[PDB]
Design an enzyme around this catalytic site. Structure first.
Site, PDB file in Angstrom:
ATOM      1  N   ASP A 171       0.969  -1.173  -0.048  1.00  7.35           N
ATOM      2  CA  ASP A 171      -0.051   0.018   0.131  1.00  7.35           C
ATOM      3  C   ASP A 171       0.815   1.341   0.109  1.00  7.35           C
ATOM      4  O   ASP A 171       1.822   1.274   0.705  1.00  7.35           O
ATOM      5  CB  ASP A 171      -0.809   0.042   1.400  1.00  7.35           C
ATOM      6  CG  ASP A 171      -1.934   1.072   1.462  1.00  7.35           C
ATOM      7  OD1 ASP A 171      -2.570   1.241   0.576  1.00  7.35           O
ATOM      8  OD2 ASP A 171      -1.708   2.135   2.125  1.00  7.35           O
ATOM      9  N   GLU A 188       1.419  -0.531  -5.188  1.00  4.23           N
ATOM     10  CA  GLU A 188       0.408   0.528  -5.405  1.00  4.23           C
ATOM     11  C   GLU A 188       1.489   1.830  -5.615  1.00  4.23           C
ATOM     12  O   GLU A 188       1.512   2.340  -4.494  1.00  4.23           O
ATOM     13  CB  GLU A 188      -0.733   0.607  -4.649  1.00  4.23           C
ATOM     14  CG  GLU A 188      -1.494   1.806  -5.059  1.00  4.23           C
ATOM     15  CD  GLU A 188      -2.000   2.670  -4.164  1.00  4.23           C
ATOM     16  OE1 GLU A 188      -1.382   3.086  -3.068  1.00  4.23           O
ATOM     17  OE2 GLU A 188      -3.102   3.529  -4.169  1.00  4.23           O
TER      18      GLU A 188
HETATM   19  C1  LIG Z   1      -6.229   7.029  -1.972  1.00  7.87           C
HETATM   20  C2  LIG Z   1      -4.799   7.142  -2.376  1.00  7.87           C
HETATM   21  O1  LIG Z   1      -4.479   8.311  -1.824  1.00  7.87           O
HETATM   22  C3  LIG Z   1      -3.187   8.918  -2.310  1.00  7.87           C
HETATM   23  O2  LIG Z   1      -3.349   9.114  -3.636  1.00  7.87           O
HETATM   24  C4  LIG Z   1      -3.059  10.502  -4.051  1.00  7.87           C
HETATM   25  C5  LIG Z   1      -2.095  10.515  -5.056  1.00  7.87           C
HETATM   26  O3  LIG Z   1      -1.014  10.314  -4.547  1.00  7.87           O
HETATM   27  C6  LIG Z   1      -2.076  12.235  -5.492  1.00  7.87           C
HETATM   28  O4  LIG Z   1      -0.803  12.037  -6.618  1.00  7.87           O
HETATM   29  C7  LIG Z   1      -3.148  12.768  -5.978  1.00  7.87           C
HETATM   30  O5  LIG Z   1      -3.700  12.030  -7.288  1.00  7.87           O
HETATM   31  C8  LIG Z   1      -4.053  12.783  -8.349  1.00  7.87           C
HETATM   32  C9  LIG Z   1      -3.335  11.768  -9.536  1.00  7.87           C
HETATM   33  O6  LIG Z   1      -1.893  11.816  -9.574  1.00  7.87           O
HETATM   34  C10 LIG Z   1      -3.760  12.713 -10.885  1.00  7.87           C
HETATM   35  O7  LIG Z   1      -3.188  12.400 -12.093  1.00  7.87           O
HETATM   36  C11 LIG Z   1      -5.266  12.492 -10.855  1.00  7.87           C
HETATM   37  O8  LIG Z   1      -5.747  12.844 -12.207  1.00  7.87           O
HETATM   38  O9  LIG Z   1      -5.854  12.916  -9.914  1.00  7.87           O
HETATM   39  C12 LIG Z   1      -5.361  12.401  -8.730  1.00  7.87           C
HETATM   40  C13 LIG Z   1      -6.373  12.972  -7.675  1.00  7.87           C
HETATM   41  O10 LIG Z   1      -7.634  12.242  -7.475  1.00  7.87           O
HETATM   42  O11 LIG Z   1      -4.254  12.314  -4.785  1.00  7.87           O
HETATM   43  C14 LIG Z   1      -4.304  11.212  -4.480  1.00  7.87           C
HETATM   44  C15 LIG Z   1      -5.421  11.289  -3.563  1.00  7.87           C
HETATM   45  O12 LIG Z   1      -5.161  12.162  -2.229  1.00  7.87           O
HETATM   46  C16 LIG Z   1      -2.031   7.756  -2.101  1.00  7.87           C
HETATM   47  O13 LIG Z   1      -1.012   7.850  -2.968  1.00  7.87           O
HETATM   48  C17 LIG Z   1      -2.442   6.108  -2.601  1.00  7.87           C
HETATM   49  O14 LIG Z   1      -1.544   5.327  -2.271  1.00  7.87           O
HETATM   50  C18 LIG Z   1      -3.670   5.924  -1.965  1.00  7.87           C
HETATM   51  N1  LIG Z   1      -4.329   4.700  -2.190  1.00  7.87           N
HETATM   52  C19 LIG Z   1      -4.127   3.429  -0.937  1.00  7.87           C
HETATM   53  C20 LIG Z   1      -3.810   4.223   0.313  1.00  7.87           C
HETATM   54  C21 LIG Z   1      -4.567   4.096   1.325  1.00  7.87           C
HETATM   55  C22 LIG Z   1      -4.192   4.836   2.866  1.00  7.87           C
HETATM   56  O15 LIG Z   1      -3.752   3.610   3.505  1.00  7.87           O
HETATM   57  C23 LIG Z   1      -6.006   3.648   1.449  1.00  7.87           C
HETATM   58  O16 LIG Z   1      -6.643   5.058   1.482  1.00  7.87           O
HETATM   59  C24 LIG Z   1      -8.073   4.830   2.071  1.00  7.87           C
HETATM   60  O17 LIG Z   1      -8.179   4.858   3.323  1.00  7.87           O
HETATM   61  C25 LIG Z   1      -7.785   5.860   4.038  1.00  7.87           C
HETATM   62  C26 LIG Z   1      -7.576   5.445   5.577  1.00  7.87           C
HETATM   63  O18 LIG Z   1      -8.990   5.195   6.127  1.00  7.87           O
HETATM   64  C27 LIG Z   1      -8.652   7.101   3.582  1.00  7.87           C
HETATM   65  O19 LIG Z   1      -8.082   8.172   4.364  1.00  7.87           O
HETATM   66  C28 LIG Z   1      -9.173   9.324   4.708  1.00  7.87           C
HETATM   67  O20 LIG Z   1      -9.706   8.848   5.815  1.00  7.87           O
HETATM   68  C29 LIG Z   1      -8.902   9.084   6.980  1.00  7.87           C
HETATM   69  C30 LIG Z   1      -9.921   8.887   8.122  1.00  7.87           C
HETATM   70  C31 LIG Z   1      -8.353  10.392   7.343  1.00  7.87           C
HETATM   71  N2  LIG Z   1      -7.493  10.410   8.466  1.00  7.87           N
HETATM   72  C32 LIG Z   1      -7.622  11.795   9.312  1.00  7.87           C
HETATM   73  C33 LIG Z   1      -8.607  11.627  10.568  1.00  7.87           C
HETATM   74  C34 LIG Z   1      -8.046  11.632  11.803  1.00  7.87           C
HETATM   75  C35 LIG Z   1      -9.324  11.310  12.617  1.00  7.87           C
HETATM   76  O21 LIG Z   1     -10.508  10.763  12.089  1.00  7.87           O
HETATM   77  C36 LIG Z   1      -6.861  11.678  12.390  1.00  7.87           C
HETATM   78  O22 LIG Z   1      -6.481  10.876  13.337  1.00  7.87           O
HETATM   79  C37 LIG Z   1      -5.674  11.628  14.265  1.00  7.87           C
HETATM   80  O23 LIG Z   1      -6.604  11.838  15.269  1.00  7.87           O
HETATM   81  C38 LIG Z   1      -7.839  10.838  15.809  1.00  7.87           C
HETATM   82  C39 LIG Z   1      -8.482  12.039  16.723  1.00  7.87           C
HETATM   83  O24 LIG Z   1      -9.331  12.389  16.278  1.00  7.87           O
HETATM   84  C40 LIG Z   1      -6.814  10.126  16.603  1.00  7.87           C
HETATM   85  O25 LIG Z   1      -7.626   9.133  17.299  1.00  7.87           O
HETATM   86  C41 LIG Z   1      -7.655   8.997  18.719  1.00  7.87           C
HETATM   87  O26 LIG Z   1      -9.008   9.540  19.083  1.00  7.87           O
HETATM   88  C42 LIG Z   1      -9.787   8.655  19.083  1.00  7.87           C
HETATM   89  C43 LIG Z   1     -11.261   9.045  19.316  1.00  7.87           C
HETATM   90  C44 LIG Z   1      -9.722   7.166  19.395  1.00  7.87           C
HETATM   91  N3  LIG Z   1     -10.689   6.022  19.076  1.00  7.87           N
HETATM   92  C45 LIG Z   1     -11.567   5.884  20.107  1.00  7.87           C
HETATM   93  C46 LIG Z   1     -13.154   5.596  19.207  1.00  7.87           C
HETATM   94  C47 LIG Z   1     -13.788   4.333  19.341  1.00  7.87           C
HETATM   95  C48 LIG Z   1     -14.875   3.880  18.414  1.00  7.87           C
HETATM   96  O27 LIG Z   1     -16.144   3.808  19.040  1.00  7.87           O
HETATM   97  C49 LIG Z   1     -13.087   3.160  19.958  1.00  7.87           C
HETATM   98  O28 LIG Z   1     -13.258   2.035  18.854  1.00  7.87           O
HETATM   99  C50 LIG Z   1     -11.561   3.277  20.447  1.00  7.87           C
HETATM  100  O29 LIG Z   1     -11.447   2.401  21.255  1.00  7.87           O
HETATM  101  C51 LIG Z   1     -11.490   4.765  20.806  1.00  7.87           C
HETATM  102  O30 LIG Z   1     -10.253   4.712  21.510  1.00  7.87           O
HETATM  103  C52 LIG Z   1      -8.256   6.556  18.795  1.00  7.87           C
HETATM  104  O31 LIG Z   1      -7.977   5.498  19.658  1.00  7.87           O
HETATM  105  C53 LIG Z   1      -7.144   7.571  19.299  1.00  7.87           C
HETATM  106  O32 LIG Z   1      -5.954   7.345  18.967  1.00  7.87           O
HETATM  107  C54 LIG Z   1      -5.785   9.347  15.736  1.00  7.87           C
HETATM  108  O33 LIG Z   1      -5.027   8.475  16.660  1.00  7.87           O
HETATM  109  C55 LIG Z   1      -4.956  10.461  14.792  1.00  7.87           C
HETATM  110  O34 LIG Z   1      -4.098   9.654  14.086  1.00  7.87           O
HETATM  111  C56 LIG Z   1      -5.721  11.348  11.151  1.00  7.87           C
HETATM  112  O35 LIG Z   1      -4.603  11.675  11.448  1.00  7.87           O
HETATM  113  C57 LIG Z   1      -6.077  12.195   9.685  1.00  7.87           C
HETATM  114  O36 LIG Z   1      -5.097  12.033   8.758  1.00  7.87           O
HETATM  115  C58 LIG Z   1      -7.277  10.459   5.964  1.00  7.87           C
HETATM  116  O37 LIG Z   1      -6.454  11.609   6.174  1.00  7.87           O
HETATM  117  C59 LIG Z   1      -8.297  10.611   4.637  1.00  7.87           C
HETATM  118  O38 LIG Z   1      -7.212  10.840   3.659  1.00  7.87           O
HETATM  119  C60 LIG Z   1      -8.557   7.313   2.229  1.00  7.87           C
HETATM  120  O39 LIG Z   1      -9.556   8.373   1.834  1.00  7.87           O
HETATM  121  C61 LIG Z   1      -8.876   5.990   1.628  1.00  7.87           C
HETATM  122  O40 LIG Z   1      -8.873   6.290   0.265  1.00  7.87           O
HETATM  123  C62 LIG Z   1      -6.269   3.447  -0.158  1.00  7.87           C
HETATM  124  O41 LIG Z   1      -7.616   2.455   0.000  1.00  7.87           O
HETATM  125  C63 LIG Z   1      -4.992   2.612  -0.910  1.00  7.87           C
HETATM  126  O42 LIG Z   1      -5.736   2.193  -1.910  1.00  7.87           O
END
Ligand SMILES: C[C@H]1O[C@H](O[C@H]2[C@H](O)[C@@H](O)[C@@H](O[C@H]3[C@H](O)[C@@H](O)[C@H](O)O[C@@H]3CO)O[C@@H]2CO)[C@H](O)[C@@H](O)[C@@H]1N[C@H]1C=C(CO)[C@@H](O[C@H]2O[C@H](CO)[C@@H](O[C@H]3O[C@H](C)[C@@H](N[C@H]4C=C(CO)[C@@H](O[C@H]5O[C@H](CO)[C@@H](O[C@H]6O[C@H](C)[C@@H](N[C@H]7C=C(CO)[C@@H](O)[C@H](O)[C@H]7O)[C@H](O)[C@H]6O)[C@H](O)[C@H]5O)[C@H](O)[C@H]4O)[C@H](O)[C@H]3O)[C@H](O)[C@H]2O)[C@H](O)[C@H]1O
Ligand SMILES: [Ca+2]
Ligand SMILES: [Ca+2]
Ligand SMILES: [Ca+2]
Ligand SMILES: [Ca+2]
Ligand code: NA
Length: 483
Positions: A231, A261
């Site tokens: 990934d 990827e």
């Molecule tokens: C998708 C693709 O992306 C990239 O591609 C880009 C490309 O590289 C770029 O060039 C451009 O592309 C162009 C292209 O080049 C052009 O030619 C063309 O024309 O156009 C395009 C444009 O379209 O753009 C592209 C897109 O940007 C990348 O290169 C690729 O590799 C990628 N594909 C793969 C990669 C992936 C990533 O692994 C996959 O992505 C998918 O999944 C992602 C993850 O789900 C998703 O991300 C989005 O969503 C995320 C949620 C978000 N995160 C933010 C949110 C946060 C919080 O919600 C934040 O978290 C921090 O803060 C939290 C506190 O608020 C903290 O949590 C603590 O508190 C909580 C409350 C606690 N939980 C408690 C709750 C409970 C529940 O009841 C209980 O269960 C629990 O017990 C309890 O404790 C927790 O415990 C605490 O810790 C967190 O800890 C803290 O970290 C976070 O930091 C934020 O970042 C992402 O930001 C957002 O992006 C993607 O959308 C999906 O696509 C993909 O599938 C792969 O294939």
């Protein structure tokens, strides 16, 4: 036999904990239609039960420890997953695991960290003075304890994060500390694209490098995996990815096929990645996805002679994994760029019946997507299965290309004497239908060939010199093979 990969999930698979049981129950069917390898979604515990696996909390929890309020992952328990893999292997189907190593999510607690903000468009530039933030970086794994690995994570194992819990603001923060800097080499987009989301792992930290290699070996061994899908490869130090793959191969003695990827519609940048990883892994052919999408959306105006222009498969055929759509390009998702339904069968004929590339079939295209738009992908298994049969039994031998018209293009396969009755003639068109004279090999002279797709009912007779006159309907595909 020709290899065919299947991605076994779509973004909207249900959070019912039965996905591993679904896979187990589909093993026979998958093997029967010609699938030789399945890519399964991230199987380790995410920051919540319903996470698809791309916000990974604990890589050592495959659904057996009570963490995040659940024992199972979204997909099921560890024992259910091992039973699925067992059923696939008993039918000679390989399993590739998805590996999410760029970041960690869902830390147990915050830590105080000194950091600077950087420019989102140029992460090499610092834009603030240093100041204290509270970042989510303390990972303790209270439900697992030290089972399998006693490594605990702290802020100094990461390069940065995008959330400060004390002021509650989102910015790209680079951490300060000993030898802290974004990793290199990574994509140079945005100056340095090491940072993507959540807490970014620091692959300059020697203990992190060592532990991640240990996990890789543990994971391959615990599940008996046959390969991996890496990934977010543009965001992870390239020499580390090269070395990590090599270490797992060395320790297991297995081939461990790997596809990365690297999301970029530019073959030159994909070639740089191949060079930097010593050609030890394949990449997904992103440019070919965009050419197919363009052809499907121009209502017949695309010049079909140009489908291979700028693609990875035209330059590095043995290092390309070809695909039509995936969990990110499906409707409503982050890289939305769906190949329109009318063209989808033509796109599948292009990647499944040609000699170059290792093709991937998408779960969402076979069984439909279950998202909430009015444009979900319908289940197309009845249209794709005849094309998979064409790959399994007929797509063998020398290939002849006919990319000589702006609408109607085709190719043939002469067959191989070791696969009885092999050989095919394929035609696709983004516009009105018509015909094309194509060569299928003098060894097939006088045979009656017919369209396996059922789209055309009139059979074609190969003449004494090995040539046949093949027909195709408008906006359609025909694949002729021995009757
Ligand atoms: C998708 C693709 O992306 C990239 O591609 C880009 C490309 O590289 C770029 O060039 C451009 O592309 C162009 C292209 O080049 C052009 O030619 C063309 O024309 O156009 C395009 C444009 O379209 O753009 C592209 C897109 O940007 C990348 O290169 C690729 O590799 C990628 N594909 C793969 C990669 C992936 C990533 O692994 C996959 O992505 C998918 O999944 C992602 C993850 O789900 C998703 O991300 C989005 O969503 C995320 C949620 C978000 N995160 C933010 C949110 C946060 C919080 O919600 C934040 O978290 C921090 O803060 C939290 C506190 O608020 C903290 O949590 C603590 O508190 C909580 C409350 C606690 N939980 C408690 C709750 C409970 C529940 O009841 C209980 O269960 C629990 O017990 C309890 O404790 C927790 O415990 C605490 O810790 C967190 O800890 C803290 O970290 C976070 O930091 C934020 O970042 C992402 O930001 C957002 O992006 C993607 O959308 C999906 O696509 C993909 O599938 C792969 O294939
Ligand atoms: Ca670093
Ligand atoms: Ca990174
Ligand atoms: Ca055209
Ligand atoms: Ca024949
Ligand atoms: Na990093």
């Amino acid at each position: 036999v020709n290899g065919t990969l299947m991605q076994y999930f779509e973004w909207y698979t249900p959070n019912d904990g039965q996905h591993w049981k679904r896979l187990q129950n589909d093993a026979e069917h998958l093997s029967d239609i010609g699938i030789t390898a399945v890519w399964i979604p991230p199987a380790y515990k995410g920051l919540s039960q319903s996470d698809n696996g791309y916000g990974p909390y604990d890589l050592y929890d495959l659904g057996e420890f009570q963490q995040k309020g659940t024992v199972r992952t979204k997909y099921g328990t560890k024992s259910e997953l091992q039973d699925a893999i067992g059923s696939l292997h008993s039918r000679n189907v390989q399993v590739y695991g998805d590996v999410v190593l760029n970041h960690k999510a869902g830390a147990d607690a915050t830590e105080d960290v000194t950091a600077v903000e950087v420019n989102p468009a140029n992460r090499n530039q610092e834009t603030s003075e240093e100041y204290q933030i509270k970042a989510w970086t303390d990972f303790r794994f209270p439900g697992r304890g030290n089972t399998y690995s006693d490594f605990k994570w702290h802020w100094y194992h990461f390069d940065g994060a995008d959330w400060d819990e004390s002021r509650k603001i989102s910015r790209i923060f680079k951490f300060r500390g000993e030898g802290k800097a974004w990793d290199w080499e990574v994509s140079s987009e945005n100056g340095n694209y090491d940072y993507l989301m959540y807490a970014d792992v620091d692959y300059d930290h020697p203990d992190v490098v060592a532990e991640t290699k240990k996990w890789g070996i543990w994971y391959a061994n615990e599940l008996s995996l046959d390969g991996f899908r890496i990934d977010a490869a543009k965001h992870i130090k390239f020499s580390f990815l090269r070395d990590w793959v090599q270490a797992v191969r060395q320790a297991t003695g297995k081939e461990m096929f790997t596809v990365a990827e690297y999301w970029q519609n530019n073959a030159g940048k994909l070639e740089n990645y191949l060079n930097k990883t010593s050609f030890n892994q394949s990449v997904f052919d992103v440019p070919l996805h965009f050419n197919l999408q363009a052809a499907s959306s121009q209502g017949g105006g695309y010049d079909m002679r140009k489908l291979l222009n700028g693609t990875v498969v035209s330059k590095h055929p043995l290092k390309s994994v070809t695909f039509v759509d995936n969990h990110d390009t499906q409707p409503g998702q982050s890289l939305e760029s769906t190949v329109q339904t009318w063209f989808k069968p033509l796109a599948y004929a292009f990647i499944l019946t040609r000699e170059s590339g290792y093709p991937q079939v998408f779960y969402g295209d076979m069984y439909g997507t279950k998202g909430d738009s009015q444009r979900e992908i319908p289940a197309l298994k009845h249209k794709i299965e005849p094309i998979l049969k064409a790959r399994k039994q007929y797509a063998y031998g020398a290939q002849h290309d006919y990319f000589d018209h702006h609408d109607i293009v085709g190719w043939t396969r002469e067959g191989d004497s070791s696969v009885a009755n092999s050989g095919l003639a394929a035609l696709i068109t983004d516009g009105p239908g018509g015909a094309k004279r194509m060569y299928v090999g003098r060894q097939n002279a006088g045979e009656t060939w017919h369209d396996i797709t059922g789209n055309r009912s009139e059979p074609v007779v190969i003449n004494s010199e090995g040539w046949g006159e093949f027909h195709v309907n408008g906006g359609s595909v025909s694949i002729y093979v021995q009757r």
